[PDB]
Design a protein around this ligand. Structure first.
Ligand SMILES: O=C(NO)c1ccc(C(=O)NO)cc1
Ligand SMILES: O=C(NO)c1ccc(C(=O)NO)cc1
Ligand code: NA
Ligand code: NA
Ligand SMILES: [Zn+2]
Ligand SMILES: [Zn+2]
Ligand SMILES: [Zn+2]
Ligand SMILES: [Zn+2]
Ligand SMILES: [Zn+2]
Ligand SMILES: [Zn+2]
Ligand SMILES: [Zn+2]
Ligand SMILES: [Zn+2]
Ligand SMILES: [Zn+2]
Ligand SMILES: [Zn+2]
Ligand SMILES: [Zn+2]
Ligand SMILES: [Zn+2]
Ligand SMILES: [Zn+2]
Ligand SMILES: [Zn+2]
Lengths: 176, 176, 176, 176, 176, 176
């Protein structure tokens, strides 16, 4: 019937965790697609590609985390298909980064709704889990991407390819 | 009258912290009893005993933590007697572990009610304290114990003593 | 209009973050004033002064943290004047420490109201941010100051200067 | 029209590389599903789970490799959806391992057909790429899984849970 | 009926070991209560608190030792409730230390009666066990506490709080 | 009446030291405001922000130095409010740097007037103090800022955002 370890875990919490798992997996797929878009010889921005590939591994980690939680709280995982990304040819580093920002805002909205739920089903554990392991990472992600979009713009992207080249070398070539 | 450092600390929060202190102490007493049950020469499962003794020290730490919080927020401690454990002869490693799971679920329920309170008396500090120092530890504890019960069962406990022996050597003989 | 990274950040949250920034800056100014009060040759309590100077740097850090959050969540900073401290001549180590306790209780009250808000505007990120980076630090601060006031009193402050001297050497001369 | 770096890369080779990319991603999804099946508290086989999680990361690496090749030879990637695994509840370690063997045999068959192609479209580079980076890994994988199935069987799986427990400790607890 | 390892262990010896176990646990509870009495912000004597907390851990060790002996000699443990301490508000460091001395004298009297028994039931093992693991520790404990009471008195406790403060810094701030 | 350590310290010297303290604090506030202006996601110049934040800490140090001198020479500190910066939105790195130059020239003018005073009230100690701890630092500051303004201009600021980006990476990304 129910697992020996289930307790205060509501069914809406569970379904939302499966949906969120599928979502994070989706984000990883998107970031992968963008990554190898910038690996293409007619784009050739190694640091853009490394960057998005890192983001893709991070998303995969987020999903696996959520699955570990599902099993943890006594819930049951159910995997769904992983929707192909909306694009196969992202136009530029700037455009890829804007799509990034929109994606991260999506995932953040989903996580905020999930926290609303865990709070309404009076599930504190799930609440503070979402808080400490996802929310801040989502704010930091959205911030980083916003700064990148701002700089790419102030430089003259996507008009000037010199811009995206320099941004690739001087911003994505060191740090996180 | 009231301590110089009291602030936003409600009286129900306080009484609940004293009750929770007594509860954690109780859990330590139980874990001790089980520990030295498995030290008995007619049981002789050194790793079961070490395991539960560790859990007992951990519970003692939880209590002392809660007392430090009471003094912290301006509350006053009041100690109550420590009820002897429901059993003096736990039947098997499997049964001891099941009683463990039930106990941890009790303590978790109490902590969740306490968080409900700290949230209703609009005490955020107490809320996130409960969250970060107890709730996750309680989920992890319940999970670990549930996995152990599952394995002891799948092996053939308590019917086969060979089982409990092997579980003692291969699962409780390394790790946490 | 609105920043690319804004999301679930309410305007009351923002104004409250600017007010809190100004408040933390104020606390730093106060702690500075007290510090160099105890640097005066007619007071001459090097450890009291070092202590309050440390507290002042800490407050400055709190403010800068809050500004980083404002920019983070898509809000906009607005700096206000920094009100001079209520006193230019704090009477004794004991009195300075009591004013300290009152100040920390003020800042704590403000932070608790801000958390109430972030919870009412359903802003979990801001909620748990306040929780993990400020609330506990505020409880610990109020506790430390309360203990100090208690000891200074039990010793005979401010009546006996021998007291404040000894407290300066044996309590503020080692540790945090 | 065509990339500056394309050369001797046939269109069937390309489409087959996109199909193979999607396939490897699928295998990673399957291995993930199995992994966290064995993380469930009513299964509780940490080493089975770690094992399949490793296999999942490996599959992800295989896919990313194939994408790097696509971009390398002048081809263009096209991502497709990732089909959910045929099962959400794998019965036992033994059954999960048998499904594993069948999957690896599928992927191997696909890779062998792809090598047949690269040989028929006289694409040596693609031929020896498939050879050195995939074929041997596929034989080794199928062998390992076959040995595991053989041992789980000879032990008495899935009938005896004691078996799967021991296999989990003594075979999946050390080595690769 | 009787354990395979029982030998020369009399029933009065056993009951006395269970009573002594409960007693040592009681002493640990008392020392804990005193400890966190001195953690209270209106007392604020960190070293008094650390001291009594150490004593509490030591008492817990004494109890666990006695349980290990019970199981050792073929006896059976029976746990009883742990009586709350006679006080919830110990007046001063001096008074807490006097209550300490009285407690240690109680425990010593009990242990001496137990040795009388082990000698009358001609149980040498139990006799020299009590001798080497408890009696000296009890004399040293009573001595230490007596010296502390003497110094607190000669200083002017509990009248002068300056006294207890200094004693806290200069005697309980270093050594055991 | 007057401090035991006062000597050759004129009252105009004192009032000027309090005014200068308030001024340095003001400069720190300004530099802070600029710093977190460049932390804004729609500006996003991490190195500009780090730079001005460093300058802000430096100014705070200057103030604390002056307070230490006041107490040193037998004077008495009097703290005044800290005027909010003239701007909340500095336009560009170039404009922020120009406002910087103007500010440093202000502080330098004030310090030069203060040295004129210490020389007219025949206060050599104060004279050479101002000389060795402030004047050179002020010339170096004004020089550095002037060079920065010159380079930002020669590059094409604020017209070209590419400029400010590059200046941020190649000039503010290494050194002081
Ligand atoms: O009275 C209510 N609804 O009708 C109510 C009471 C408490 C909360 C709350 O704790 N939100 O975080 C929300 C709604
Ligand atoms: O039958 C044939 N030609 O008439 C034939 C048979 C095998 C190959 C081959 O192995 N290519 O790699 C090529 C041609
Ligand atoms: Na939290
Ligand atoms: Na000079
Ligand atoms: Zn994510
Ligand atoms: Zn993300
Ligand atoms: Zn609520
Ligand atoms: Zn506990
Ligand atoms: Zn527990
Ligand atoms: Zn603060
Ligand atoms: Zn503070
Ligand atoms: Zn593969
Ligand atoms: Zn494979
Ligand atoms: Zn004892
Ligand atoms: Zn003792
Ligand atoms: Zn300056
Ligand atoms: Zn300056
Ligand atoms: Zn002259």
């Amino acid at each position: 019937s129910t697992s020996q370890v289930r307790q205060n875990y509501h069914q809406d919490s569970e379904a939302a965790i499966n949906r969120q798992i599928n979502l994070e997996l989706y984000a990883s797929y998107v970031y992968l697609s963008m990554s190898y878009y910038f690996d293409r010889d007619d784009v050739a921005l190694k640091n853009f590609a490394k960057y998005f590939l890192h983001q893709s591994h991070e998303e995969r980690e987020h999903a696996e985390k959520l699955m570990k939680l599902q099993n943890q709280r006594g819930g049951r995982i159910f995997l769904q298909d992983i929707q192909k990304p909306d694009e196969d040819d992202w136009e530029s580093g700037l455009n890829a980064m804007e799509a990034a920002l929109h994606l991260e805002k999506n995932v953040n909205q989903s996580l905020l709704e999930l926290h609303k739920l865990a709070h309404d089903k009076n599930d504190p554990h799930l609440a503070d889990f979402i808080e400490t392991h996802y929310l801040n990472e989502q704010v930091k992600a959205i911030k980083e991407l916003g700064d990148h979009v701002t700089n790419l713009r102030k430089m003259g992207a996507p008009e000037s390819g010199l811009a995206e080249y320099l941004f690739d070398k001087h911003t994505l070539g060191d740090s996180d």
